[PDB]
């Protein structure tokens, strides 16, 4: 529907707030800035007290340069809603540069910047600069016009706390500590009043909501007339960058170039600053006419184009002349907006009387903007007509349908990393002499295009077969040699059998499968490049099983012949192979019949571990070091696969000779049971993977080796229970005969019994025993151990002794001798 | 001589074929076109191949090569007969990335015929080309633009270098400060003279870059034969000209040098020579391998060695030995039931320039529009502390010359434990000894205490003054004696053994704890009529003791 603007808008021509604060007075009543508004070189701004809520939008741009005594930019811009940017200063719409006192932006009501971008630089006291997502503010098209640098963010500004405010992109979004920034969904495209209250598309920057519910745009998206928005101006009126005015009115509106005070010309319904191409203004400056034919020529002087803004003043120039070569040296952090400006600057030219030079450029994508260039005239830069040196962004020369006749001289090319040599060679028929090849002293071979993929042709590489250690590759794309055997169908011809060296294959371990490519410089060349092969069939060996490799194929030829092909990266994973040994196995003795095994798998498993495996085998305990007399010095204490589940049990069923149990891959601990007491045990800790389907559906039962190698670990059950000593002790006099003590050895020895201690003591108080040593062996030959003893009452104790060490004594018994 | 045939050296492998050749012959031009993929060591192979050559019958060509740092590897070349490649040229150098210098400083080559050719060598200075000017047989006054690429050689290998003085302001245990005293003139100063290192535009200067690396020999060189080198630690660039190298290893010969970093379009540059310095002493490392062993009751032996770097000059080893009280019997543990025999313990760097260039140009663009034209010690010292009774040392310490790796004690408290340090110390620098007060010393190493015990005793424990009594001639026999004068640890049980002097009789012995002697220090034993013999002995936490001499009594 028809839509209104809020407030009766009043325009005021471009403004420059300069020198002194009192000059702000001219900014009064300015609803919209007709042109650009610049505030600069105010040594002290503190005295100013009046804000300007009326100022709503600006057509061209805003620049703040060397203004001090200002802390919050909101002091001047309460309601700067939208920046239209019909004209940009060097492609930028908002500039805040070299200001020391600035700390707060306060752009709460700002919603949209329609063109170009923003540069905020050299404001040491500024903060929150990087917090606002400018991408939400800029146009939906290319957005990289965002440079936020050198604003005291080293350490001091890290107090940019923001309110507490919404948190997104791992950061808060706020203009300052007390102003959270506002977004809105895609349905509004960043002209919503708040997160949800979005106005009509007719508005830009928002709208006021009437108490009656009617909307009132802050600014028209399209042109405006009589405080109402519509798509286009009514007949009889001419658009002037925000609204419709009469021809007589438009004649009076001026706009400011680098130096020229231009005045709009009302023509085809537009209040254009100067007539378009192929047209000339009437000497009365009332309208535009086709002049004397299409050739409304205009000559201009050559010079140094150091920046986009400097290029504007060449607009409308058809002929460039002057002994000084025209040099293009524009250098931008990115070519986000260079073409749109250079085209306007130079697209009119068609012939150049002097040479062309393009060196030390940053952000040039191509020379396309010479839309009508046809002749260079090579006047010089002596002996060189075209000069291209050190352009680390230049990509291609004139468009395919363009043709420039270099009347005199040669050309020079060097250090153009992304300029493809194939594009260079398109100039060969364009020189006056039309040579068949460039001199080797005027165009490099490695200096140009050494880093840009540019042309070439795509090569189809396919993986044929794989293994646990190797892989094999094809290259499906054909290769015609010399005379093409059969034209068409992706021949990728090499015009000489001598030329085609062969295919070169690369590969390297990459779990994520996102590595870029082999670089052109030493170091970081981590690709294990293989030697060239003519057949196109290659084999990769010595590969780590179950690892994600990445590979690609590149061709090569003699003398860097420019006809070459290359392939994109691809990923494949080797087969599982054999899992590695289990890590850090430890065995501990829990009791006389339990062993506690703990293990971890801090190693590459390959595949997926499917079944842990533990096996324990009884190892016969050591016995009878007969080389040593135990009675002289006794031992006091001791020191230290293809299978199926289930264990084996002893004849008496008191212990397991061998134990083997399958486990799920969870387990990290296990404890046996019913184990022999005091016997060493050999322990496996084996892991296994899943079997590849081929390994059982197309392989017979041999080799296999789905399970890791086994490393044995030994441990001993601890000492058995306190019991298991000499049983059934009794003592009696043999009759004056010697006393005899008889017993039976234990049925369950703690290892074979080596010595017996007959500890006997008198019953008199404060007495100590005189134990004697018997070296086992001949113990029970006499059905009892004899002992000489004198008259008296005694108490007898007996204990065993084994490799496990000393036992413990049986309970005392008494005997009286007379 | 061999007069080997000339040819094309497409790789290092083919270069090996030229080993030992003193003269190169063949009408076609010798060609060096070696690439280098995924590797290094081009220099060694090539020189091993061509080092012998001293004369080339035909012209020399080298182009489309990477990593060929220089043409100086012709270690014996002095003549080039110059039979061409084209009829006009005898030395042909083209498109050689990273090639930066022709023949060595003390070498000359006589181009017998023809001129030279040079183009598209981004790292080779034009001025280095003119070094060949006086060598040509034709003796030209200069090289024509058609023969030398004045504006296409070394365009980013700038060599207008001027030297920078550098000086160390202060050094420390782990840090040092570096100055640059040749004042670079950032931005033309417009009043004064001097300051030869001047940048025409202040924005063009990025900052000084400091290089430093460890070099025990102090002979590391700036460049390297391999096209990639990462031994230098490269600091970030700053414009102040002052840097503080930190996290250094004390007392290690460092080597450093500085270079000025500028935008790619600025031709002037400057570099310093390699300088050396040491990081002052630090805390010497703790003594290694220390071990202590017993020699006798009152004598112990200590040995040690220094197997790790000292971080300074050793001034003296220091040994200390503190007596630590020997164990006391745990009263809750029984004796005469559990007797003791006492077993005893013990990469791409590629700086980028886009940002600064863009800012520099935007600055110019803006101004043209704005303006208008109208628990451990720290006081180690010599010390001996003899016990009050004066038999043994309770604390012993001494200094030793640094070459004495072993030391022994004497007159120790026989059976007992001892804790001992073995600590090194280094010399004091004047800035510490005549500039600092006695705190924060840190000039001596830490120690790891080693606990060791002596031997029991030569004659061990004994119970002298034994005598046996029988009173009232109805009372039981009783034994008298005095405890050991200097018992090991403390005596836990007294064990009076006795025997009957009659055939078929064997000694049998009592057993009592050390207590039960407070009344008269006498013990009574019932016994029947007969002739006996007694012999007492003591048992101590240190182990069993020796018997005394026998005694006799005739009971009745």
């Amino acid at each position: 529907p028809t839509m209104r603007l809020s407030q009766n808008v009043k325009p005021c021509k471009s403004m420059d707030i300069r020198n002194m604060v009192s000059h702000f007075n001219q900014l009064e009543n300015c609803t919209v800035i007709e042109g650009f508004l610049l505030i600069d070189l105010i040594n002290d701004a503190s005295p100013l007290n009046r804000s300007f809520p009326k100022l709503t939008e600006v057509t061209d741009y805003i620049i703040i340069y060397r203004v001090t005594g200002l802390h919050s930019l909101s002091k001047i811009f309460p309601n700067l809603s939208v920046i239209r940017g019909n004209k940009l200063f060097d492609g930028y719409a908002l500039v805040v540069y070299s200001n020391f006192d600035l700390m707060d932006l306060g752009l709460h009501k700002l919603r949209s910047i329609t063109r170009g971008g923003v540069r905020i630089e050299k404001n040491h006291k500024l903060c929150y600069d990087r917090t606002i997502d400018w991408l939400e503010i800029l146009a939906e098209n290319e957005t990289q016009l965002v440079v936020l640098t050198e604003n005291g963010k080293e350490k001091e500004c890290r107090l940019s706390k923001c309110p507490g405010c919404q948190l997104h992109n791992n950061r808060r979004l706020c203009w300052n500590s007390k102003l959270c920034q506002t977004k809105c969904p895609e349905k509004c495209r960043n002209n919503c009043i708040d997160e949800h209250t979005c106005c009509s598309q007719d508005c830009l920057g928002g709208c006021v909501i009437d108490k009656n519910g009617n909307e009132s745009c802050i600014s028209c998206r399209n042109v405006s007339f009589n405080n109402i928005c519509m798509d286009s101006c009514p007949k009889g009126y001419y658009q002037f960058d925000s609204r419709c005015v009469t021809a007589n009115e438009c004649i009076t509106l001026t706009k400011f170039e680098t130096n020229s005070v231009y005045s709009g010309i009302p023509y085809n319904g537009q209040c254009i600053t100067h007539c378009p191409t192929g047209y000339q203004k009437s000497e009365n400056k009332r309208m535009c006419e086709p002049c004397p034919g299409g050739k409304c020529d205009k000559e201009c002087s050559s010079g140094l184009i150091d920046s986009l803004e400097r290029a504007r003043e060449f607009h409308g120039c058809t002929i460039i002349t002057g002994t000084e070569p025209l040099t293009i040296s524009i250098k931008r952090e990115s070519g986000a907006h260079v073409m749109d400006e250079l085209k306007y600057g130079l697209a009119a030219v068609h012939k150049i009387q002097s040479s062309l030079m393009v060196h030390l450029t940053y952000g040039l994508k191509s020379l396309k903007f010479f839309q009508s260039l046809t002749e260079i005239s090579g006047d010089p830069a002596d002996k060189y007509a075209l000069y291209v040196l050190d352009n680390r962004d230049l990509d291609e020369l004139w468009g395919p349908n363009q043709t420039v006749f270099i009347r005199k001289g040669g050309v020079f090319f060097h250090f153009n990393p992304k300029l493809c040599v194939s594009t260079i060679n398109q100039l060969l028929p364009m020189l006056a002499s039309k040579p068949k090849f460039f001199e080797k002293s005027d165009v490099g071979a490695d200096s140009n295009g050494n880093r840009g993929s540019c042309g070439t042709a795509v090569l189809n590489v396919t993986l044929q077969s794989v293994g646990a250690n190797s892989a094999m590759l094809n290259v499906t794309t054909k290769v015609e040699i010399g005379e093409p055997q059969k034209p068409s169908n992706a021949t990728i011809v090499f015009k000489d059998p001598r030329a085609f060296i062969g295919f070169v294959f690369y590969h390297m371990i990459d779990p994520y499968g996102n590595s870029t490519k082999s670089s052109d410089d030493p170091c970081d060349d981590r690709w294990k490049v293989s030697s060239p092969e003519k057949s196109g069939v290659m084999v990769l060996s010595n590969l780590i099983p179950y690892t994600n490799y990445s590979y690609y194929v590149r061709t090569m030829a003699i003398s860097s012949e420019l006809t070459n092909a290359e392939s994109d990266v691809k990923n494949f994973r080797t087969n599982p192979g054999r899992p590695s040994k289990v890590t850090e196995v430890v065995a501990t003795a829990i009791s006389d019949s339990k062993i506690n095994v703990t293990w971890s798998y801090l190693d590459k498993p390959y595949g997926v571990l499917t079944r842990y495996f533990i096996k324990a085998k009884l190892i016969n305990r050591p016995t009878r070091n007969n080389n040593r007399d135990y009675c002289t010095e006794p031992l006091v204490k001791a020191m230290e696969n293809t299978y199926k589940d289930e264990e084996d049990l002893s004849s008496n069923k008191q212990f397991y000779e061998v134990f083997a149990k399958e486990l799920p891959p969870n387990q990290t601990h296990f404890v046996f049971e019913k184990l022999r007491h005091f016997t060493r045990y050999a322990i496996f800790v084996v892991a296994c993977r899943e079997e590849i389907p081929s390994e059982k559906l197309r392989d017979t039962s041999f080799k296999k080796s789905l399970c890791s190698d086994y490393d044995t670990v030994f441990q001993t059950t601890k000492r058995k229970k306190f019991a298991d000593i000499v049983m059934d002790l009794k003592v009696d006099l043999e009759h004056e005969s010697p006393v005899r003590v008889r017993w039976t050895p234990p049925v369950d020895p703690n290892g074979e019994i080596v010595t017996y201690e007959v500890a006997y003591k008198l019953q008199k108080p404060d007495q100590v025993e005189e134990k004697k040593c018997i070296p086992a062996a001949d113990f029970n030959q006499t059905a009892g151990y004899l002992i000489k003893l004198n008259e008296g009452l005694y108490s007898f104790r007996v204990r065993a002794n084994s490799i496990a060490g000393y036992g413990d004594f049986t309970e005392v018994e008494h005997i009286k001798v007379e | 001589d061999k007069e080997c045939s000339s040819g094309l050296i497409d790789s290092l492998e083919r270069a090996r074929e030229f080993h030992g050749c003193t003269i190169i012959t063949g009408t076609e031009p010798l060609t060096i076109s070696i690439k280098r993929e995924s590797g290094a060591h081009v220099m060694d192979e090539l020189k091993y191949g061509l080092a012998a050559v001293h004369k080339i019958q035909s012209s020399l060509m080298v182009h489309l090569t990477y990593g060929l740092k220089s043409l100086k590897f012709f270690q014996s070349l002095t003549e080039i007969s110059g039979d061409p490649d084209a009829d006009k040229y005898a030395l042909y150098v083209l498109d050689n990335r990273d090639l930066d210098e022709l023949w060595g400083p003390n070498q000359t080559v006589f181009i017998r015929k023809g001129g030279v050719f040079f183009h598209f060598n981004p790292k080779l200075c034009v001025s280095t080309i003119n070094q060949l000017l006086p060598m040509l047989a034709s003796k030209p006054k200069f090289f024509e633009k058609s023969d030398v690429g004045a504006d296409s050689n070394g365009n980013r290998g700038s060599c207008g270098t001027a030297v920078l003085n550098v000086t160390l302001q202060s050094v420390g245990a782990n840090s040092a400060m570096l100055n640059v005293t040749t004042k670079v003139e950032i931005g033309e100063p417009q009043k004064p003279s001097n300051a030869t290192i001047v940048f025409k535009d202040p924005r063009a200067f990025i900052g000084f870059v400091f290089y430093h690396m460890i070099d025990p020999y102090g002979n590391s060189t700036k460049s390297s034969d391999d096209p990639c080198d990462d031994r230098w630690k490269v600091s970030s660039p700053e414009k102040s000209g002052v840097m503080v190298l930190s996290n250094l290893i004390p007392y290690t010969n460092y080597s450093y040098y500085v270079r000025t970093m500028a935008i790619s379009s600025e031709l002037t540059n400057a570099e310093s020579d390699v300088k050396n310095f040491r990081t002052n002493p630090g805390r010497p490392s703790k003594v290694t391998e220390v071990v202590a062993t017993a020699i006798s009751d009152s004598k112990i032996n200590v040995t040690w060695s220094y197997l790790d770097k000292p971080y300074g000059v050793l001034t003296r080893y220091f040994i200390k030995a503190k007596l630590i009280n020997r164990p006391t019997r745990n009263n809750n543990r029984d004796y005469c039931t559990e007797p003791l025999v006492k077993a005893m313990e013990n990469s791409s760097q590629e700086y980028d320039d886009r940002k600064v260039q863009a800012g520099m140009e935007f600055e110019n663009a803006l101004q043209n529009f704005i303006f208008v034209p109208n628990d451990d010690e720290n006081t180690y010292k010599d010390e001996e502390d003899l016990s009050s009774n004066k038999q043994f040392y309770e604390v012993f310490a001494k200094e030793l010359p640094p070459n004495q790796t072993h030391f022994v004690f004497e007159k120790l408290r026989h059976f007992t434990r001892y804790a001992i340090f073995v600590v090194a110390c280094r010399e004091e620098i004047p800035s510490e000894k005549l500039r600092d007060t006695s705190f924060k010393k840190s000039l001596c190493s830490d120690y790891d205490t080693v606990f060791q015990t002596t031997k029991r005793k030569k004659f061990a424990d004994i119970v002298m003054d034994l005598k046996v009594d029988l009173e009232h001639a109805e009372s039981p026999v009783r034994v008298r004696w005095t405890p050991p004068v200097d018992p090991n640890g403390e005596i836990v049980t007294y064990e009076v053994a006795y025997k009957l002097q009659k055939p078929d009789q064997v000694e049998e012995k009592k057993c009592i704890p050390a207590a039960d002697f407070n009344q008269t220090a006498g013990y009574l034993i019932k016994l029947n009529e007969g002739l006996y013999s007694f012999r007492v002995r003591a048992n101590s936490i240190a182990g069993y003791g020796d018997f005394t001499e026998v005694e006799h009594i005739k009971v009745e």
């Binding site: 020198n19 | 931005g187 025409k200 535009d201």
Partner: peptide, 23 residues
């Protein structure tokens, strides 16, 4: 040669004031 910050300072020192661009 005066450029950038140095020229800005020289301008600040000289004339104590500047002229408009679109008065």
């Amino acid at each position: 040669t005066l450029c950038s910050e140095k020229l800005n300072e020289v301008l600040s020192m000289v004339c104590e004031e500047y002229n408009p661009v679109i008065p």
